[PDB]
Design a protein around this ligand. Structure first.
Ligand SMILES: [Ca+2]
Ligand SMILES: [Ca+2]
Ligand SMILES: [Ca+2]
Ligand SMILES: [Ca+2]
Ligand SMILES: [Mn+2]
Ligand SMILES: [Mn+2]
Ligand SMILES: [Mn+2]
Ligand SMILES: [Mn+2]
Lengths: 10, 237, 237, 10, 237, 237, 10, 10
C-alpha cells in the first residue's frame, strides 16, 4: 500500500 | 538444455510471445508460452501467498495465488509429470526484471513431497519450511542476483541499499538436496509448495515476475534469460 | 435423515440396486448407488491400503486401493463438498455383513484436514493417526458391533472367539472430535485419509464391504442398514 | 493359506 | 475433585500463598503452589509466545515463555506423569482476573501428542493447530466466560464491547477429544503445546494470569476459582 | 580433524579402550570413549528401533533402543551442543566390522529438526523420512562400503551375494542437505532421529556396531577407522 | 505498547 | 531361526 496499478480492495 | 516445469506469477504482459494482455499466473511446461493462464489482480506493495499442489492420482497440477481479504486466482492443468521430468529433480524459486522492475521478495517458503511405494504403507517424504532466511543459508543454492539476509528475507533480484529494485536482474534459489519426484511403481506421489511474496514497484508497470519451478538437478540460469524469460528459458519458443 | 459422502470398498455385487457385477470401489454421495465406480481386484486374506484425498481447488474426490505388488483401483468424481455437507462434520469407518460374511478388520487409520482462511498464513489443521487400537479407545465413537483391542486392531463387525466372521452385522467408528471440513472465507481446504484393512472370508465368498465416510456430527447407524447398505443408508434409493 | 474367492494373489 | 497439571503465566504476586514477589511462570502439580517457578518479565500489551514440552524418556516437563527481541524465561521440573495423571486426559487453556484485571487473549494454539507403543514402529498421534478461532468452534469446549469469534481470537475472560477487561472473571477452553497421554508399555511418550497470548491491562498491576493445563476428561471450573486460583484449583492448598 | 557427536549401538566390548564388558549404547562427544553408557540386551537377528532426541531448553541428549516385546536401553547426557558443534552440520549413520562381523542393515530412517528464532512464530524446519532406499538414492551421501537398493534397505557394511557379513568394513550414509542445528537468536532448537535396524551375525559373535552421528559438513571416513572405531574417530583417545 | 509495568526492551 | 549370541528372545 505505498501504492499500486489497477488495484484497491474495497 | 534444462527440463523445466513452472508456475509463474507474470506481472508484465508480453503479448508478443503469448502473454494474455494483463497480469496473470500460468503453468509452463518446458516453455515460457504457458499451457494455461488465469487473470491475476496483482497488488503492488501487498504481501501475497502462492499455493501449488499436485498428486499422481489426478495427475493435475494446480495453483492458487491470493491476497488477504481479496479474491483468488486459480489455474489447473492436466499433466503427467512422469513423462516430463526425470525422477530426481531440484525445486526452486526464480524471478527477474527487464526495462521495468519490481522487488521480488520471498518472506517464507515451504515444500512437502511424499512418495508412497507399492508396499504395505511404505512412504518416503521430504519437507522443509523457511520462515526466515539468514545471511549464510547453506541449504540453499543461490544463483544469479539472489541474496538472503536482509530482514530475514530472500531477495531474488537486485535491490539497492535504500530498497529500490534494479532493472535487468535475474535470480534463483534452489533447495540443496535433490528431490525424488516420481517413481515407476509409486501408488501415490504428491507435493505441495507454498510461499509468500512481496512485489513492489516504483515506476509505472512492474515486471517481470516470480516463478516456482522444478528442474533437472544441475540446472542453472540460461544466458540472457532476464526480463520476459523469468530466468527460466533460453528463448521464447 | 443424514448427509453421507462415502468411498466404499464393496466386496459383494448387488446388481439389483446398481452394483456392477464384481467387487468394486465407488464414491457415494447421499446414496448407496455410487456416482462412479471402478472394478477392484479384491484379494481375500491380504492386508490392503485405501487412500482418499480431496482439495477445494479442484473439487475432486479421489481414492486409490491397492495390495502390495499388485495393481491399484482408482476412482474419482468432481464434487463441491460445500453444497453437500454442513461445515462441521464427523469422519469414520463403516462395514457390514449379511447373508454372506467377511472380517472387516482395520489395522491402522490416519486423517489430516487443513483449512487456510482469508488471512496471511492462517491455517487450522487436525491430524490423528492410529496404528494400534486399545481396548478402551476414548477418542473413538464405536457404534453397532464395532470393537477395539483385539490384537490392537479395530473389528468393525462381529467376529467369533478366534476369527470367524458373523453374518448380519454392522459397526462404525467415528473420530470423537468434530471436523471443520470447509469454510466460506477459505482459500484452500483439503483433507486426506488412509487406512490399511484385512478382509477375510473363511468360505471363499465375502460380503459386504468397508466404507470411509463423512457425515453430520450426530450420525448413527440407520435402521436395518446391515448387508448391502454398509451401515450408511436407510434404503437403496 | 486362507486364500480367496476369485482375483489372483499368493 | 480434579487432577490438574499446569504451566501458569502468573501476572500477579500473591505472596500470601507462595508466589515469589514478582511476575513469574511456574509448574503446578495438583496445587496452585508451584513446585518450581522462574522470574518472568511480562510485557503489558506485547504479543508473547509460550512453549511447553515433555517426553517420557527424560520425564521432565519444561516451559519457555518469551517476547520478540527480548529474553526468555525458562522453567523445568522432573516429574513422572504416569503417576500423576490418568492415561486419558483433556488439554486446555485457563485464565482469570480478580480485583485487578487484564485481557487474556489467545491468538493461536497448537498441540502435538505421540505415543510410541512397544511394537515395530507403532505410533499413535494427535495434532491440532488453531490459527484463528470462529464464533462457533465445535472442536472446543468453552467453560466460564470464555468466548471465540472477535478478530478470530479466543478471549478466555470477559471483555467489554470497547475492549476493556473485566474483573472477577474465569474462562477455560478445552480441546473436545480426549487425549491418550500415557500407557503402561509406551517406549516413548511425548507432547508439546504452543500458544501466543496478548495480555493488556488498563489499571496499575495486571492479574491474574493464563495457564496451560492437563486434567481428567470431565473437569470443570471449581467454584470461586477466580483471581489467584486461575480457574484451576478450588483452594490454595 | 572433525567434530563428532554420536549415539553408538556398540555390539562388541573392547574393554581395552573403555567399553564396559557387554553390548551397550552410549553417547560420544568428540571421542570413541563414551561419556555415558547403558547395558543393551542386543538380540541378534531381530529388527530393532533407535530413537534419539534433543532440545535446547534442557540441553540433554537422550536415546532409547528397544526390540518388540522387550525391555529398552536408555542413556542420557547433559550437553550444550552450541559449544560442541558448528551451526551447520550434516547427519548420518555409520557402522563397521573388524575381526568379527555382523550385518549393519538399516530398514528405515527419519529425522526432524526445528528452529524457532527471535521472532513471532518464526520457525525453520527440516524433515526427511526413508522407509525404503532405491539403488540410486541421490539425496544420500554414501561413503566407504555403504550401499542401497538391496531389498529396499541400506547396507552400511559389505555383505556377500546373499547375506554373509564381511570383516574389516566401514560405511556411512549422510543426508545430502546441510542442517542448521542451532542458532544464537534461537528460542528453542530441537531435533529427533529414528531408525530401525537389523544386526545379524551368522556365527553367534557380532561386532562392531552402528552409530547415529552429527558432524561438520565435509566429514569423511577417518583413516583406518574400521572395527572398534565405528568409522567415526581416527584413534581411540 | 500502549504501555506496560517494569518494562521496555532497549 | 538364525538366533543370537547371549541376550534372550524368540
Ligand atoms: Ca511476461
Ligand atoms: Ca454391494
Ligand atoms: Ca498469583
Ligand atoms: Ca566396541
Ligand atoms: Mn506469461
Ligand atoms: Mn456398490
Ligand atoms: Mn504463581
Ligand atoms: Mn563403546
Amino acid at each position: 500500500m505505498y501504492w499500486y496499478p489497477y488495484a484497491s480492495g474495497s | 538444455a534444462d527440463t523445466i516445469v513452472a508456475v509463474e506469477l507474470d506481472t508484465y504482459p508480453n503479448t508478443d510471445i503469448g502473454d494474455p494482455s494483463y497480469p496473470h499466473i500460468g503453468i509452463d511446461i518446458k516453455s515460457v508460452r504457458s499451457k494455461k493462464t488465469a487473470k491475476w489482480n496483482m497488488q503492488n506493495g501487498k504481501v501475497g501467498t502462492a499455493h501449488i499442489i499436485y498428486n499422481s492420482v489426478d495427475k493435475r497440477l494446480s495453483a492458487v495465488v491470493s491476497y488477504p481479504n481479496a479474491d483468488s486466482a486459480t489455474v489447473s492443468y492436466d499433466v503427467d509429470l512422469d513423462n516430463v521430468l526425470p525422477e530426481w529433480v531440484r525445486v526452486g524459486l526464480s524471478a527477474s526484471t527487464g526495462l521495468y522492475k519490481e522487488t521480488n521478495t520471498i518472506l517464507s517458503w515451504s515444500f512437502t513431497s511424499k512418495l508412497k511405494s507399492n508396499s504395505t504403507h511404505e512412504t518416503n517424504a521430504l519437507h522443509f519450511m523457511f520462515n526466515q532466511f539468514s545471511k549464510d543459508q547453506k541449504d540453499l543454492i543461490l544463483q544469479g542476483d539472489a541474496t538472503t539476509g536482509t530482514d530475514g528475507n530472500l531477495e531474488l533480484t537486485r535491490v539497492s541499499s535504500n530498497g529500490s529494485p534494479q532493472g535487468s536482474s535475474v535470480g534463483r534459489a534452489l533447495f540443496y538436496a535433490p528431490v525424488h519426484i516420481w517413481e515407476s511403481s509409486a501408488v501415490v506421489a504428491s507435493f505441495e509448495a507454498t510461499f509468500t511474496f512481496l512485489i513492489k514497484s516504483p515506476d509505472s508497470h512492474p515486471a517481470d515476475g516470480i516463478a516456482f519451478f522444478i528442474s533437472n538437478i544441475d540446472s542453472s540460469i540460461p544466458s540472457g534469460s532476464t526480463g520476459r524469460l523469468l530466468g527460466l528459458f533460453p528463448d521464447a519458443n
